[PDB]
């Protein structure tokens, strides 16, 4: 496992975290890279299961080699830990469309910051 990119696409499978609270926590977990923009959605699969997708655009190219670096724990019972798939976002515009339009969600998208126009 290795990622080295300003632009991260995270998916937490089977994850019930509120998008806003995951976003706020990722702002601190990724603070070494100076996050500039985050979007987070809860996708619902057709079986009802939730999957939390996050796009992070950082100012600095982020080296992530610890696959557990972005795990998050919920703050109420049963205090589950959620482990994400961490990938480079190859095309932030495509990933943002996936998160904010393509996936089915019945709750609001969480966003923070000014979207970066990537070269």
Describe this protein's structure.
- The protein has helices at 19-29, 92-102; strands at 3-13, 35-44, 50-64, 72-73, 81-82, 85-88, 110-113.
- It is α+β, with helices and mostly antiparallel strands and 119 residues long.
- The chain has a single domain (1-119), classed as Replication Protein E1, Chain: A, CATH 3.40.1310.
- Strands 6-1-3-2-7 form a five-stranded antiparallel sheet, with helices on both faces. A two-stranded antiparallel sheet has the order 4-5.
- The chain is globular.
Write the layout of secondary structure elements.
Elements: E1 3-13, H1 19-29, E2 35-44, E3 50-64, E4 72-73, E5 81-82, E6 85-88, H2 92-102, E7 110-113
Antiparallel strand pairs: 1-3, 1-6, 2-3, 2-7, 4-5
What oligomeric state do these chains adopt?
monomer
Q: Which CATH class applies here?
A: Alpha Beta
Number of helices: 2
SSE pattern: EHEEEEEHE
Strand content: 35-45%
What name does CATH use for the topology? Replication Protein E1, Chain: A
Binding site for a divalent metal cation: 43, 51, 53, 102
Main location: host cell
GO cellular component, one term: host cell nucleus
Keywords: Covalent protein-DNA linkage, DNA replication, DNA-binding, Endonuclease, Host nucleus, Host-virus interaction, Hydrolase, Metal-binding, Nuclease, Nucleotide-binding, Nucleotidyltransferase, Repressor, Transferase
